[PDB]
Design a binder for this molecule. Structure first.
Ligand SMILES: [Gd]
Ligand SMILES: [Gd]
Length: 60
C-alpha cells in the first residue's frame, strides 16, 4: 500500500467522520486510489477508522 494514498484516505475520513462502504470506495477512487479496499484495511489496522455495518467511522 502506497504511503501518499494512506495520507489521502486519512484526510478524507477526517473531513467525512462516518461514511458508507460504497460512498467511501467511490470517493477514494475519485481521489486517485485504484484499490481503496487495501488502503481502508490498513487504516483499520492502524486504528484510524473502525468498521460498523457497511460504514466506516473515524476513531478520534
Ligand atoms: Gd467499536
Ligand atoms: Gd465498528
Amino acid at each position: 500500500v502506497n504511503q501518499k494514498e494512506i495520507e489521502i484516505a486519512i484526510e478524507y475520513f477526517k473531513n467525512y467522520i462516518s461514511v458508507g462502504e460504497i460512498v467511501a470506495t467511490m470517493d477514494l477512487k475519485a481521489r486517485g486510489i485504484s484499490n481503496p479496499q487495501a488502503v481502508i484495511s490498513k487504516l483499520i489496522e492502524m486504528g484510524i477508522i473502525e468498521k460498523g455495518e457497511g460504514c466506516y467511522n473515524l476513531v478520534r
